[PDB]
Amino acid sequence: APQNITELCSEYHNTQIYTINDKILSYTESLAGKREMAIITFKNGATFQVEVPQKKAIERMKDTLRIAYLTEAKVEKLCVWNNKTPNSIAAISMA
Amino acid sequence: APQNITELCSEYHNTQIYTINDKILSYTESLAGKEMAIITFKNGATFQVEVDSQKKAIERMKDTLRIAYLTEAKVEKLCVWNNKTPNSIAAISMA
Amino acid sequence: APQNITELCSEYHNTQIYTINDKILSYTESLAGKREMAIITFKNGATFQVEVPSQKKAIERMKDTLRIAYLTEAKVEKLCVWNNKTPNSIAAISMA
Amino acid sequence: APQNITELCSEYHNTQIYTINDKILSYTESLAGKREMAIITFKNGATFQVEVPGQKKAIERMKDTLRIAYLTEAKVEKLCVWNNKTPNSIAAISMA
Amino acid sequence: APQNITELCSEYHNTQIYTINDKILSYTESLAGKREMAIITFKNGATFQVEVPGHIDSQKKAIERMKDTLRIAYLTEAKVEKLCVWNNKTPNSIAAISMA
Numbered sequence: 001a002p003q004n005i006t007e008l009c010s011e012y013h014n015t016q017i018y019t020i021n022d023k024i025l026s027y028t029e030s031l032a033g034k035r036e037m038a039i040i041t042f043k044n045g046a047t048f049q050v051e052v053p054q055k056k057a058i059e060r061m062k063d064t065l066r067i068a069y070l071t072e073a074k075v076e077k078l079c080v081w082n083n084k085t086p087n088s089i090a091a092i093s094m095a
Numbered sequence: 096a097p098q099n100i101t102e103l104c105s106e107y108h109n110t111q112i113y114t115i116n117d118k119i120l121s122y123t124e125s126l127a128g129k130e131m132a133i134i135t136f137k138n139g140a141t142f143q144v145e146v147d148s149q150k151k152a153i154e155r156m157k158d159t160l161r162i163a164y165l166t167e168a169k170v171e172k173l174c175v176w177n178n179k180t181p182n183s184i185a186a187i188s189m190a
Numbered sequence: 191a192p193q194n195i196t197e198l199c200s201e202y203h204n205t206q207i208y209t210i211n212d213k214i215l216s217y218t219e220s221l222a223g224k225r226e227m228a229i230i231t232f233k234n235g236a237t238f239q240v241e242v243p244s245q246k247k248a249i250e251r252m253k254d255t256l257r258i259a260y261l262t263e264a265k266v267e268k269l270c271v272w273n274n275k276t277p278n279s280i281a282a283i284s285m286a
Numbered sequence: 287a288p289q290n291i292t293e294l295c296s297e298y299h300n301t302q303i304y305t306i307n308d309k310i311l312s313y314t315e316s317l318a319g320k321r322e323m324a325i326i327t328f329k330n331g332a333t334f335q336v337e338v339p340g341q342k343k344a345i346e347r348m349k350d351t352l353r354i355a356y357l358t359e360a361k362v363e364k365l366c367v368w369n370n371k372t373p374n375s376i377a378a379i380s381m382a
Numbered sequence: 383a384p385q386n387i388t389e390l391c392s393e394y395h396n397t398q399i400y401t402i403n404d405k406i407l408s409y410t411e412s413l414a415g416k417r418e419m420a421i422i423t424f425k426n427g428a429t430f431q432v433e434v435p436g437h438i439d440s441q442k443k444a445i446e447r448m449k450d451t452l453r454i455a456y457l458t459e460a461k462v463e464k465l466c467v468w469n470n471k472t473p474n475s476i477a478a479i480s481m482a
């Protein structure tokens with residue numbers, strides 16, 4: 001298996017790593033039909049989503065983003081799909 | 096996808112955004128059948144979460160409200176269906 | 191729909207509001223068969239249960255709520271309870 | 287329904303109350319096949335398990351409760367345990 | 383049943399116990415297809431994963447619980463005492479964790 005988020009991210013097409021090193025600025029979530037999604041932003045002007053639906057991992061990701069937001073946990077890197085707008089989170093690291 | 100709560104909210108009929116910028120004043124939860132969640136703010140607003148991709152999102156929104164309440168997190172905006180009393184929560188943003 | 195716990199409570203029978211305005215004193219839970227239940231107490235001498243069981247998920251949520259309220263010493267405002275059970279059975283909770 | 291952990295525990299065969307009044311010393315959790323279990327220890331020398339399931343939701347809830355009690359250093363009042371297992375197997379927990 | 387993580391670990395092939403006694407340095411999780419996994423590291427250079435579910439049917443719940451545990455451990459800076467890991471995987475795969 002990959003040893004870290006950068007190696008993991010590299011195994012996928014249409015991805016990149018954002019090095020953030022900052023807490024989440026805003027956290028948004030929606031239960032509205034066909035838009036069951038989460039959005040986060042950062043002070044650097046980045047906006048990322050967790051896309052509407054593996055199914056278990058998407059739910060876990062939204063759980064992680066929420067508690068990271070509320071606890072002001074520093075996000076190190078995000079691996080994101082850059083063929084979606086907002087870019088879609090594939091992986092997160094916290095250090 | 097929508098980049099923020101205001102864009103998301105616009106995609107539905109009978110929705111509106113409320114700008115709150117305040118912590119939740121009260122959190123009410125009911126298991127009595129026919130299963131309410133209710134929040135209030137000091138500005139005098141009352142919202143509910145009404146009882147599938149959507150079923151899991153509904154359960155998540157209730158989790159988010161309880162933890163926002165307990166952590167005293169500032170709620171930025173809510174997207175609500177205004178054809179229900181209290182108004183019914185579609186999305187939340189926290190900043 | 192109801193807009194507060196007091197309004198909500200009065201839409202059911204065999205209920206009343208306890209106005210607690212206090213943290214939970216103790217929290218008890220059991221996985222023993224037929225007694226899959228939670229019990230809370232307060233300083234004022236009151237003992238309440240979450241009865242052994244969608245509505246299913248509401249009951250699990252209630253127990254999650256009481257555990258976290260207990261652990262964080264969150265002030266409980268009111269409980270709507272069924273008073274035809276012993277201990278009285280929690281229908282709803284408000285925290286303010 | 288029982289009004290506290292002791293009454294509850296008394297309804298079952300092969301159980302006992304351990305009165306601990308202390309935080310959990312160690313928390314151990316396993317995903318290994320056939321050993322999907324939790325173990326807790328106390329400073330007084332006691333070791334307890336949550337048995338691998340063989341009630342399902344309540345068993346998962348109990349593991350959640352033990353983990354958060356441990357991390358928050360929550361004082362465990364009493365444990366109702368089955369004593370025909372080694373380690374004794376947790377049926378119920380009270381915190382105060 | 384085993385009474386501790388070492389006894390437990392000794393019942394399995396291809397495992398060892400790492401005695402860590404330290405909080406988690408980094409926590410990583412991915413939802414990317416066939417890489418639904420968590421990775422943790424420690425200051426001493428250890429890297430461990432919770433493997434993608436591949437496992438029986440009761441293990442699935444326990445895999446999900448482990449990832450929950452590692453996330454909250456990391457966020458609360460809980461000292462991890464020992465890990466029982468399969469060492470025929472890289473990163474080594476977590477079978478059990480003890481916290482003290």
Ligand SMILES: CC(=O)N[C@H]1[C@@H](O[C@H]2[C@@H](O)[C@@H](CO)O[C@@H](O[C@H]3[C@H](O[C@@H]4O[C@@H](C)[C@@H](O)[C@@H](O)[C@@H]4O)[C@@H](O)[C@H](O)O[C@@H]3CO)[C@@H]2O[C@@H]2O[C@@H](C)[C@@H](O)[C@@H](O)[C@@H]2O)O[C@H](CO)[C@H](O)[C@@H]1O
Binds near residue numbers: 042048085
């Ligand atoms: C939080 C917020 O207000 N977001 C809105 C904003 O987001 C974009 C802007 O912040 C611009 C400013 O340059 O950057 C876009 O991202 C670029 C990215 O730029 C670099 O990273 C960002 C985070 C900043 O650090 C920039 O200064 C950097 O140069 C490039 O590296 C990348 O190649 O291209 C993207 C654009 O495709 C911001 O876009 C948002 O965030 C990124 C990461 C993507 O997820 C993108 O899809 C997002 O839209 O303005 C946009 C409108 O363009 C929206 O209104 C956001 O709400």
Ligand SMILES: CC(=O)N[C@H]1[C@@H](O[C@H]2[C@@H](O)[C@@H](CO)O[C@@H](O[C@H]3[C@H](O[C@@H]4O[C@@H](C)[C@@H](O)[C@@H](O)[C@@H]4O)[C@@H](O)[C@H](O)O[C@@H]3CO)[C@@H]2O[C@@H]2O[C@@H](C)[C@@H](O)[C@@H](O)[C@@H]2O)O[C@H](CO)[C@H](O)[C@@H]1O
Binds near residue numbers: 182183193
């Ligand atoms: C917390 C509380 O006391 N709630 C009870 C209260 O709630 C209503 C009042 O607060 C009135 C005062 O005029 O406003 C209602 O909301 C209006 C809304 O007004 C605007 O937003 C509110 C929150 C205040 O800040 C006002 O000053 C604002 O002008 C209008 O913008 C909107 O078009 O219409 C609604 C009414 O539907 C409050 O109603 C509650 O909150 C809103 C957001 C809805 O969800 C609604 O369904 C709620 O009832 O009084 C009512 C009965 O009058 C109940 O007792 C509430 O529990």
Ligand SMILES: CC(=O)N[C@H]1[C@@H](O[C@H]2[C@@H](O)[C@@H](CO)O[C@@H](O[C@H]3[C@H](O[C@@H]4O[C@@H](C)[C@@H](O)[C@@H](O)[C@@H]4O)[C@@H](O)[C@H](O)O[C@@H]3CO)[C@@H]2O[C@@H]2O[C@@H](C)[C@@H](O)[C@@H](O)[C@@H]2O)O[C@H](CO)[C@H](O)[C@@H]1O
Binds near residue numbers: 231236277278289
């Ligand atoms: C925490 C504890 O040890 N509880 C045990 C105890 O609880 C009962 C006592 O606390 C008595 C003392 O009067 O009150 C019972 O409650 C009454 C209630 O009284 C009001 O609330 C209590 C908590 C006090 O604050 C009083 O001053 C109040 O007036 C009445 O209003 C109500 O009509 O009747 C109940 C009794 O049926 C306590 O009973 C427990 O808690 C109440 C809220 C119910 O849920 C009831 O079912 C509970 O048993 O004593 C009992 C045995 O009598 C148990 O051992 C409790 O565990």
Ligand SMILES: CC(=O)N[C@H]1[C@@H](O[C@H]2[C@@H](O)[C@@H](CO)O[C@@H](O[C@H]3[C@H](O[C@@H]4O[C@@H](C)[C@@H](O)[C@@H](O)[C@@H]4O)[C@@H](O)[C@H](O)O[C@@H]3CO)[C@@H]2O[C@@H]2O[C@@H](C)[C@@H](O)[C@@H](O)[C@@H]2O)O[C@H](CO)[C@H](O)[C@@H]1O
Binds near residue numbers: 327328333372
């Ligand atoms: C934490 C630890 O190191 N645990 C290992 C240990 O646990 C046993 C010892 O702690 C002995 C020491 O006397 O007591 C056992 O428990 C007894 C119990 O004794 C009393 O209660 C305990 C908690 C202590 O306070 C003692 O001082 C008391 O005398 C009796 O009440 C009971 O009737 O019998 C049990 C034994 O079954 C400890 O056993 C463990 O904990 C108990 C509560 C059970 O769950 C039991 O199954 C456990 O084994 O030693 C054992 C092997 O002997 C393991 O190595 C533990 O890891």
Ligand SMILES: CC(=O)N[C@H]1[C@@H](O[C@H]2[C@@H](O)[C@@H](CO)O[C@@H](O[C@H]3[C@H](O[C@@H]4O[C@@H](C)[C@@H](O)[C@@H](O)[C@@H]4O)[C@@H](O)[C@H](O)O[C@@H]3CO)[C@@H]2O[C@@H]2O[C@@H](C)[C@@H](O)[C@@H](O)[C@@H]2O)O[C@H](CO)[C@H](O)[C@@H]1O
Binds near residue numbers: 474
């Ligand atoms: C945190 C980090 O940056 N990790 C990257 C790193 O990890 C390996 C190194 O840290 C070396 C140091 O020699 O040890 C590897 O583990 C060995 C293990 O060595 C002993 O334990 C570690 C924790 C150190 O304390 C060493 O000093 C010890 O000698 C041996 O006992 C074992 O037989 O072999 C393993 C693997 O070579 C680290 O590997 C990672 O951690 C271990 C526990 C396993 O889970 C392993 O599979 C992991 O890869 O370097 C690797 C590339 O080699 C990656 O870049 C890591 O991200």
